Amino acid sequence: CSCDGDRRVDCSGKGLTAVPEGLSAFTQALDISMNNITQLPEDAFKNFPFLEELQLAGNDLSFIHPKALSGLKELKVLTLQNNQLKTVPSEAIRGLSALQSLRLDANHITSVPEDSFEGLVQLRHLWLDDNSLTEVPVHPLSNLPTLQALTLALNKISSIPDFAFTNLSSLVVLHLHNNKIRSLSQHCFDGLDNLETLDLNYNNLGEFPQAIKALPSLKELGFHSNSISVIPDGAFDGNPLLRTIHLYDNPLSFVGNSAFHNLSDLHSLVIRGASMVQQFPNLTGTVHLESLTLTGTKISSIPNNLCQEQKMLRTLDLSYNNIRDLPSFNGCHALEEISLQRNQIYQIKEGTFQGLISLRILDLSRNLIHEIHSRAFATLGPITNLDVSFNELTSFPTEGLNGLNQLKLVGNFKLKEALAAKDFVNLRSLSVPYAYQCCAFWSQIIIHCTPSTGAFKPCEYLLGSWMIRLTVWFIFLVALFFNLLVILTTFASLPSSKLFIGLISVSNLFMGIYTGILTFLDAVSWGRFAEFGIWWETGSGCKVAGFLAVFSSESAIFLLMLATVERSLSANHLKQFRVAALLAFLGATVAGCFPLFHYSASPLCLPFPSLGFTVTLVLLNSLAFLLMAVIYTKLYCNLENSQSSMIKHVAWLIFTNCIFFCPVAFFSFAPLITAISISPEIMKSVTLIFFPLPACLNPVLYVFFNPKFKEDWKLLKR
Structure with a gap:
């Protein structure tokens, strides 16, 4: 041993x-x-x-x-x-x-x-x-x-x-x-x-x-x-x-009202899970308590004399409760752990929190406070963590909240106004319902907002740099006018295969309006986007742009689906195509309301980055091109003019449409298959230029490669 x-x-x-x-x-x-x-x-x-x-x-x-x-x-x-x-x-x-x-x-x-x-x-x-x-x-x-x-x-x-x-x-x-x-x-x-x-x-x-x-x-x-x-x-x-x-960790259901009275030497009180408790217990004689962790109860109101007697209080945990009205906390000189969360509190008055010189934790989350007084927080001292997240706030008071080490506001979806960065100077961690707010909070100190702001939800410039800013603007001017060139052309003189080539321009024209709305919003909101982005994404402006964004893309493919089918007749049916052409428009406006019914991924409002509309479109437009190619694989089964001219145009309308939408899709097929080697900025640029670009050379293709426009521009002018 x-x-x-x-x-x-x-x-x-x-x-x-x-x-x-x-x-x-x-x-x-x-x-x-x-x-x-x-x-x-x-x-x-x-x-x-x-x-x-x-x-x-x-x-x-x-x-x-x-x-x-x-x-x-x-x-x-x-x-x-x-x-x-x-x-x-x-x-x-x-x-x-x-x-x-x-x-x-x-x-x-x-x-x-x-x-x-x-x-x-x-x-x-x-x-x-x-x-x-x-x-x-x-x-x-x-x-x-x-x-x-x-x-x-x-x-x-x-x-x-x-x-x-x-x-x-x-x-x-x-x-x-x-x-x-x-x-x-x-x-x-x-x-x-x-x-x-x-x-x-x-x-x-x-x-x-x-x-x-x-x-x-x-x-x-x-x-x-x-x-x-x-x-x-x-x-x-x-x-x-x-x-x-x-x-x-007990199956505590009910606690007596006077069961916790006359404990002068008691130094702690934790009650978790007492569902049957309906009122605050009698704390008379217990003037030396430090914590009442009364969680999991159904108490409805805190007595106003709470810490008029609890002069030595430090911690107040009344979470998981049914508290509706908060009493005045004046006299709570040593209380630092207010955590009134998961309650039904609906308002904060000026005197609700007045007198909390030592409060450092504030956890007013998961509540229903629609309004908080401007001077409610103006009395507090060194508050480090204020968590008001997941509430119904509409305006956030800011006086006396300079030293907020950590702030949480996510879930207040109606807090449209972006918080200033001057009244939260000593802030380290933030969370706001819309990322536009944090873009504003970011001389300054290292901030750790978690709405995940970035290129997809831009803070300053909607469309990348001046390059994408002009090509999209270049697309709009070409798509708006060259289509209106075709719109006045083919509908101011209809052989169906020359109607469709005209109806496709109608669908693409609204794409020019959408990308015109897109370039107009960027032009007015140039140099800043947080001020206008929240009003845009949440407001009805996104829905109008979103409706035209997908309606143009779907109807152009849907009409082009009928275009090759109509041109396959070369291998009587004009009546069935006029109604079907309207059906393609009618079948596209229903695929334009799914966003609008039942995007906040971008201000671009497209539906493509919600594994609903996104997959059901990229698996239907790609399958569209699959059918739309095998049919045109058959047009050439042919081992003559005025119909071969229509063959070349539709074929070239097939080739360009399948390349462009192909890119927008692989990338809009999401990085689900493989997330490596992606860029939320470069890939959003290409899905920003190459998505409406197919509805940008369709009018400067028909006007240039296929002679019917030359035979129609003469027909208008003479």
Whole structure:
């Protein structure tokens, strides 16, 4: 073993097969812990008259001979942790007259015989932890008049009967954690007037052990993680000196109104899950509380005298409640943990928070406060975290909120006005319903907004740089006029294949209007977009631009779907095509209202970055081109003019439409398949120019490559 020089024998870590021999008579401590001795011969430690500290822990004793442990009349602590003794060696510990602590704990004690613990009059600390005691050894425990600290924990006892603790008149510790006592009688705990700490946690008592009324000196009462669910009124009248209570993680349904009154020394109060509680408890006499974590209750109003009496308050957690009206918190000079969340509070007045010089946590989230007074926060001091997120706010007061270390406002969807950056100078973390707000909050300090602002939801410039700004503008001028060139052309002179080539221009013309609306919004909102973006994205302006954005794209493909079908007649049907052409327009306006019915991905308002319309369009426009190509693969099955001229135009209207929409799609097919090698700016530029570009060369294709326009421009002018 190893061993230290205080006249102490401590034989640990050797696995000795017997009692060590040849040891001194003056050894103040005989420790033989952590070896493999199974039993002791009679008078095994007789050679050692002057013992004070016996430590035979972890030796795994099985059977103690009747006279084996005798010969020790003056040891202070006897310790046999990690043992396998079935019964307490009472026939051997009867001579333990000068004991100070019998650590019988961590043993296999299943039952203590009736003639036990006799002579143990000087003992102070009794330990039967980690054992299998089916019941309190009352009669053996009756022989312990001066025992100070007893631990009956980790045992197999189911209940404590009457007069089970009377003789323990000096007991100050009662540890029963990880035990299974389910009941106790009224007089059972009588006689423990010297008790200071009572442990009943990690247990299964289904009712409040009200028998604690005979514990006037009790100060620590821990029964948390129990089966207790009801709290009878006046459960602590007999415990005026109690200072702490452990009752967390319990099926607490109802708590008495006056059950928490006259606790002058109480320093904490946590009540989570008390659904049946409807009113604030009576806190009279408890002027020394630090926290009331009253969560999971149904209280409707906080009394106005709350901290007119709780002058020493620090924490107020009333979340998961039905609080509607907040009283004045004046006088709460030491309160720093207001967390009134998940409540029904609808308004904050100027005097609601006045007088909170020490408040540092504000958690007014998940509430219904539609309006907050401008001077409501003007009195507060060093508030670090204000979380008002997920509310119904329309205007956010800003006076006195300079030092907000962290701010949370997400979910206030009607907070249209963007918060200024001058009245939140000392801000580090922010969260606002619309990213435009944070774009404004970002000389300054490192800010950590999380609406995820970026290129898709632009802060300053809608369309990338001046390059994309002009090409889209270039598209608009070409798409608006060259189509109106075709609109006046083919409908101011209709052979259907020359009607469709004209009806496609109608659909593309609204694309020019959409990209004209897009370039007009950017032009007016040049140099800034937060001021106009919120009014644009949320307002009806996006819907009008959004309707034309997809209606033009769908109808152009839908009409071009009919165009190749009409031109496939070369391989009578004019009547069925005029109505079908209107059906394509009618079938596109329904695919233009799905946004409008049932985008806030961009101000571009397109539906393409909602795995609804997006997938159902890119899998229908691509399948459109698939059918639209296999049909035209057949037109050339042909192993002549005025219809071959129509063949080339539709073929070139096929080739250009499938390239452009192909890009917009792969990229609008989303990075779902693979997110690597993407750019929320470069890829939004290409989906910004190459989406309406197919409806930009359609009018300067028909006008230039196919001769019917030359035969129609003459027809108008002459």
